[PDB]
Amino acid sequence: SGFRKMAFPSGKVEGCMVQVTCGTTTLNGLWLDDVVYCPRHVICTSEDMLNPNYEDLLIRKSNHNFLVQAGNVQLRVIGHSMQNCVLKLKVDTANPKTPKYKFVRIQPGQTFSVLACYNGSPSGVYQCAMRPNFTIKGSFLNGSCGSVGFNIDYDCVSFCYMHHMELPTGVHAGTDLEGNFYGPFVDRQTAQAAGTDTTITVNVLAWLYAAVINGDRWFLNRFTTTLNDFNLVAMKYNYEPLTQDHVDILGPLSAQTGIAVLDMCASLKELLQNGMNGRTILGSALLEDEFTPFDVVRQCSGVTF
Amino acid sequence: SGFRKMAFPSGKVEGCMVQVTCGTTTLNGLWLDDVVYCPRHVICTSEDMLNPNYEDLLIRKSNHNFLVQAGNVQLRVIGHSMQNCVLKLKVDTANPKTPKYKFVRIQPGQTFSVLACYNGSPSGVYQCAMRPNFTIKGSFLNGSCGSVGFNIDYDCVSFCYMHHMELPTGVHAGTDLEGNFYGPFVDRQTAQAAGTDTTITVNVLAWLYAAVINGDRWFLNRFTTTLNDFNLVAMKYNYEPLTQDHVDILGPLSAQTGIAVLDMCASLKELLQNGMNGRTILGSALLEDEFTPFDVVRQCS
Numbered sequence: 007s008g009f010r011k012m013a014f015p016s017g018k019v020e021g022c023m024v025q026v027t028c029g030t031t032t033l034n035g036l037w038l039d040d041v042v043y044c045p046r047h048v049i050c051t052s053e054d055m056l057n058p059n060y061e062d063l064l065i066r067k068s069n070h071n072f073l074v075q076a077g078n079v080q081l082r083v084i085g086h087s088m089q090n091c092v093l094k095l096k097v098d099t100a101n102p103k104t105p106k107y108k109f110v111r112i113q114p115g116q117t118f119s120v121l122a123c124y125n126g127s128p129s130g131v132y133q134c135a136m137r138p139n140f141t142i143k144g145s146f147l148n149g150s151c152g153s154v155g156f157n158i159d160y161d162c163v164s165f166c167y168m169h170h171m172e173l174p175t176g177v178h179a180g181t182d183l184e185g186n187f188y189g190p191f192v193d194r195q196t197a198q199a200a201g202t203d204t205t206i207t208v209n210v211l212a213w214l215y216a217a218v219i220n221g222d223r224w225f226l227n228r229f230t231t232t233l234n235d236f237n238l239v240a241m242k243y244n245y246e247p248l249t250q251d252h253v254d255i256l257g258p259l260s261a262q263t264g265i266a267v268l269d270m271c272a273s274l275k276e277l278l279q280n281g282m283n284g285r286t287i288l289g290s291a292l293l294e295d296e297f298t299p300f301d302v303v304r305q306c307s308g309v310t311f
Numbered sequence: 312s313g314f315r316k317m318a319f320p321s322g323k324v325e326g327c328m329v330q331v332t333c334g335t336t337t338l339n340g341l342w343l344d345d346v347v348y349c350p351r352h353v354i355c356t357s358e359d360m361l362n363p364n365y366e367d368l369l370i371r372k373s374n375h376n377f378l379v380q381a382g383n384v385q386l387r388v389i390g391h392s393m394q395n396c397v398l399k400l401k402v403d404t405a406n407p408k409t410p411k412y413k414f415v416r417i418q419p420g421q422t423f424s425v426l427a428c429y430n431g432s433p434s435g436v437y438q439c440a441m442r443p444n445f446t447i448k449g450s451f452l453n454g455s456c457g458s459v460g461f462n463i464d465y466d467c468v469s470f471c472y473m474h475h476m477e478l479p480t481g482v483h484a485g486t487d488l489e490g491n492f493y494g495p496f497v498d499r500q501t502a503q504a505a506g507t508d509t510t511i512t513v514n515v516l517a518w519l520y521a522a523v524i525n526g527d528r529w530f531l532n533r534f535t536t537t538l539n540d541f542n543l544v545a546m547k548y549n550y551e552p553l554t555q556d557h558v559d560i561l562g563p564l565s566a567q568t569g570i571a572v573l574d575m576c577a578s579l580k581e582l583l584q585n586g587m588n589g590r591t592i593l594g595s596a597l598l599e600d601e602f603t604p605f606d607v608v609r610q611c612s
């Protein structure tokens with residue numbers, strides 16, 4: 007019993023975190039094989055950021071300008087190239103702690119663990135979701151750029167996020183490991199704002215199934231709904247549309263609990279129109295949308311890494 | 312910016328998790344140097360659990376009865392001893408991944424990270440608090456016994472908890488790494504129930520300071536309170552008494568935000584009286600009590 011916001015064990019990623027210094031800027035890098043990946047904004051000054059020609063800025067840099075540090079050992083940079091908004095620093099030494107890994111780009115609603123780092127040293131791990139507006143509601147201070155988001159699939163680390171910036175509302179924006187930003191963000195000092203966010207419907211349904219598995223049934227009702235009627239109600243409450251793919255992915259939880267997805271949808275509909283009425287679900291007075299259906303199954307079945 | 316329930320990176324603890332098998336029971340062990348620590352109930356059957364005599368049960372065991380597995384390598388048990396409710400299995404190999412560590416016993420209200428394991432393999436990491444009733448509201452399934460709680464301040468791992476059991480209400484009980492239970496719990500199938508839980512007041516105050524540091528000020532008010540009047544109110548909502556130690560501990564957060572401790576107490580009294588009125592504090596519609604003053608400072612500065 008119990009349901010917690012649980013992150014993947016961070017050990018495989020800790021052995022990859024390095025410190026990257028270029029000029030006055032120090033941020034984090036991801037050391038995999040003989041390449042250190044980091045945000046390309048490490049090559050920028052406060053003025054450079056206003057209007058940066060990154061090819062022009064990088065052509066002026068030499069390998070010795072990048073100081074890479076893995077623990078108390080300085081790595082030697084033997085090459086540098088840029089791929090989108092990530093800088094790839096070729097180093098002489100392959101990381102002996104390089105795990106089995108993949109670079110994956112996630113979709114909004116998908117969750118991942120963030121290993122927040124400062125000066126190449128991991129300070130904390132937490133669970134996140136890629137919001138429908140492509141921001142993440144992370145916890146980051148100055149120096150956290152280059153901190154990565156990941157999932158574990160068996161013994162394989164799937165790197166899905168690299169931290170680049172904090173938007174004015176305090177939410178976070180970053181790229182996949184190929185340097186492509188999530189969302190309409192740019193690594194330029196310009197007016198940028200997170201779009202109006204929506205609630206990840208399939209994840210709220212997964213979390214309601216997790217509550218039923220844990221013994222919370224007060225919100226259940228005798229009613230069902232059509233997927234079309236549910237989506238009409240979801241549109242009104244700034245909830246993401248629920249697709250047939252979402253209904254299919256919730257199937258195993260529906261079979262285990264005995265509550266069909268459209269039956270759980272009628273529960274969610276009543277919760278949206280009437281609220282919780284002073285009650286809580288899994289110790290929360292709000293509907294939680296940062297547990298995917300796979301996260302609920304993994305936690306309520308105990309998959310290991 | 313942002314405030315999340317954040318756990319310590321679990322890497323230093325992952326390299327210590329092993330599988331411990333005794334008879335039909337398989338649980339987790341903590342392999343540090345040449346000793347594997349695990350709950351002593353691994354030697355029991357369901358029949359023994361009602362009134363087990365652990366000294367009697369352990370004297371009948373030999374080293375080859377304990378099967379210790381570290382990854383895909385079987386460790387050789389060369390000794391066994393019991394210290395309170397923890398079994399210490401001496402092994403023939405020192406763990407090369409043993410971090411700098413300490414065994415620390417924590418107080419109610421203290422927080423820690425839990426690395427939940429099954430079959431000696433880590434499955435997840437989450438943040439917990441030792442409740443005032445000495446239970447933890449963990450997330451554990453069968454096979455999670457031996458999973459540990461820890462803090463990693465500096466490069467030293469402070470092991471503070473080892474999971475032993477789940478109480479009937481779904482909450483969890485266990486021991487420090489010296490085998491002493493937190494709370495009035497015993498490792499036996501007798502009628503045991505968690506006492507009525509209370510809210511960790513000092514932690515809610517710390518979290519209200521975290522919200523002020525992050526720009527949330529709607530809950531602040533022009534009032535202050537005496538510590539005695541605050542405790543008389545807080546008690547009626549099942550909140551733990553706030554002591555002078557708690558007030559002193561909140562001093563740095565009070566100095567940083569410019570809000571006196573007893574002034575933040577008056578905001579808490581008002582939130583308890585009114586509720587949030589559809590508002591949230593740090594993305595939460597309830598008052599959070601699982602961030603200590605030390606956690607708030609760590610995360611915000």
Ligand SMILES: O=C(Nc1cncc2ccccc12)C(F)(F)c1ccc(Cl)c(Cl)c1
Pocket residue numbers: 047055146147148149150151170171172173192193194195196312
């Ligand atoms: O916002 C930034 N990073 C931070 C990351 N994460 C959290 C931060 C908290 C405080 C200060 C800064 C933070 C930044 F590095 F300064 C930055 C600024 C502008 C741009 Cl266009 C880019 Cl790409 C990057």
Ligand SMILES: O=C(Nc1cncc2ccccc12)C(F)(F)c1ccc(Cl)c(Cl)c1
Pocket residue numbers: 007352360451452453454455456475476477478497498499500501
């Ligand atoms: O409660 C137990 N463990 C589990 C731990 N954590 C969660 C569990 C969930 C389901 C089943 C079991 C769980 C137990 F190991 F079976 C157990 C039972 C009685 C006693 Cl007195 C002792 Cl010391 C230990």
